[PDB]
Symmetry: D3
């Protein structure tokens, strides 16, 4: 069930300058989510990372997947009417290639386990630019309090 | 031919944040045509103001994006005049067809018509092969 | 000759920072004309980028300022369509004569040409001045309302 | 004389978002300076002061006069080739009227005493909107 | 635990980003005294402009910070007047001793002098410290 | 004395606003350990978006902060490779215990595990505290030099 940005803002509480999901292109509740982040020079972090060379900070690639993963969780089960999800842990992150201004960051997050009893969700994540892997995440752990 | 990435764009244009609106130049033929792109993300400073309830890339910023791409072409076509500060002198026949939204890739093409430093150029911008903006004539001054 | 102060402009237009470019409306005649102003200060976020070595108000933002003023006139001339999100559909015959600089007061006048309850097609012309001298001309702004 | 924004930046080290003099319209070395700050909604402080009502922060009115004062000092005597001035004290500030988006803040600073390259300058300041007084400052004290 | 944290500060003050200059209120006594802090980081929007070559927290923003703290004390001391928009009406006897730099914790204390059941005028004094050392003094802040 | 603050940090790291997340280095021992701090204020540009209703310092930026402090250590431990652009190659075993809030002082310690200046491969561990209490743990940060 594809998606436009206004509806993302209804699901996630993130705003500027920390909303890092531009569009959700495919979603299957309780299973997988595919979305994208457009990487433009006209973004506030770029001036600091770095003046002489513009490279999207790896941590913000984590944040982007984590937000996409967080959308999946909130659509998969919103019985807990709390959209404030906090990152509890992340594991096995590997950055292969620099993400640069001009790139389309295509992202996929996959739900591993949900314990709606605690609020404990675990997800994996991969990000691509031009079909080539730029970031891998073995395991994102989330906790809505 | 060979890509002009963002670090090299900054060496041609004087524009900086928050008013550099060309992310990448993908093709250029001096004195003829230029193709580039602007990635449209929600994480841009203008989107909060246009509009809170619905994020739509301002039409005037699409003009600015094409104009900067057109400005690159001029400066690489003839840099005998060593001045990179090129002002907009006139624009004509602009038509916006479709809203440009967060998540889109704005693909842009500018075409040089006449160079004398009065340069005239035409411009088109696409999202998904669909035309979003047309510009008959951009006029620029040295 | 009812001025309009920034707070009431915000009630009409949906634009916010950093893209609201009308500071005050000084005169308005529904279905006819509107005069307002935009104060041009160095303390505006666009100036760092346009340009580092020389601050000049982006021509396009002069277009946007007139367009927003024009869009006020439209929404006060006829608000039966309770939609304040107006989109720019076309612009024609823009000519920039003089650079607009930090310190200037941009005085703006927009004039309604045609309005159609068609699908919300409004056409307007615009002129911007600094110190009584013309800095921007616009023959025709075309507005559509989603 | 006049002094543009490009030339202002040559004198003052202040940059965005803390340069609060747009134009210097009259200046007499060692005596008086008149300049202006254009107050627009399109300034970064206005979102925070305040969401429900945009009012230019008084402290920034102080800054603006102080920056204008600082220009006068640096053009009055630049033997000390240091443009980094610091505010050492301010006294007798009174805000009469709110300064709002749309206003032109016209500012005048008057040099009282200058003590060489000890570096102590004292100046007074007034700001106006529409010929009406918005801010008074009895004494700004600078370290050179 | 007579304190107030960021979220509850925002319930009291109308100030938002980039002009909210109180991070935490650590002690408060209605109608008497208030102690709070402002964390000073390089990651604040004003530092780019003040100054590119040397980051120093603008003195006027040290005035603002204390005044905001002072403003909290007023609003918690007497909220019968259900208006949280306090304007600075005057300030007097401000003296900056030492530069406040990125990395510092600005600890602030404001003390209520007079509150008028006649006017709507409050007068307060302020001191700001970094590492127990005095950085800013304010004899008198006047609020309406 | 071992005191390094923000002007000297900027000489070591290439990071600028809004992405320099180390305010002060309070202790450093080349090739071994580094201790520094980040002051957490409401007057930071990320807080508006994370989150409007509740200001909490994004976990990822806690990572970045420790990584930058780790990066200082590397560049002061061995600068034979005259390149200050360090990229994050991997991170492992991150756990966030407690929310970091406006008003907090984030105290940070990074410890060098292995350096192979041959390649440009450095591994480091990191811990962040607020009020002596652990807020973030990082088993392993891996950094490449390009
Ligand atoms: O926007 C502008 C409008 C009017 C002027 Cl006097 C200058 C402007 O800024 C520009 C500078 C340089 C280039 Cl190459 C531009 C290209 C297109 C549009 N504006 C440009
Ligand atoms: O700065 C200001 C100067 C003059 C005015 Cl008319 C208003 C100002 O903004 C403020 C509003 C409320 C409070 Cl409690 C303030 C506290 C300190 C500084 N400014 C404050
Ligand atoms: O605000 C400031 C307060 C304290 C310091 Cl240490 C510096 C400040 O910024 C300024 C720099 C230079 C000049 Cl000439 C100023 C003039 C007035 C106010 N602030 C000024």
């Amino acid at each position: 069930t594809s998606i436009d940005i206004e509806d993302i803002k209804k699901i996630l509480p993130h705003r500027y300058p920390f909303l890092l999901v531009d569009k959700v292109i495919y979603m299957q509740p309780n299973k997988t989510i595919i979305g994208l982040k457009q990487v433009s020079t006209n973004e506030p972090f770029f001036n600091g990372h770095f003046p002489q060379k513009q490279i999207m900070p790896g941590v913000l690639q984590i944040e982007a997947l984590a937000q996409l993963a967080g959308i999946l969780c909130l659509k998969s089960d919103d019985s807990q009417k709390n959209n404030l999800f906090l990152f509890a842990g992340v594991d096995g992150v590997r950055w292969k290639k620099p993400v640069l201004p001009g790139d389309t960051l295509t992202m996929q997050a996959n739900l591993i386990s949900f314990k709606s009893s605690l609020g404990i969700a675990k997800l994996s994540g991969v990000g691509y630019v031009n079909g080539k892997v730029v970031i891998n995440i073995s395991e994102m752990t989330f906790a809505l309090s």
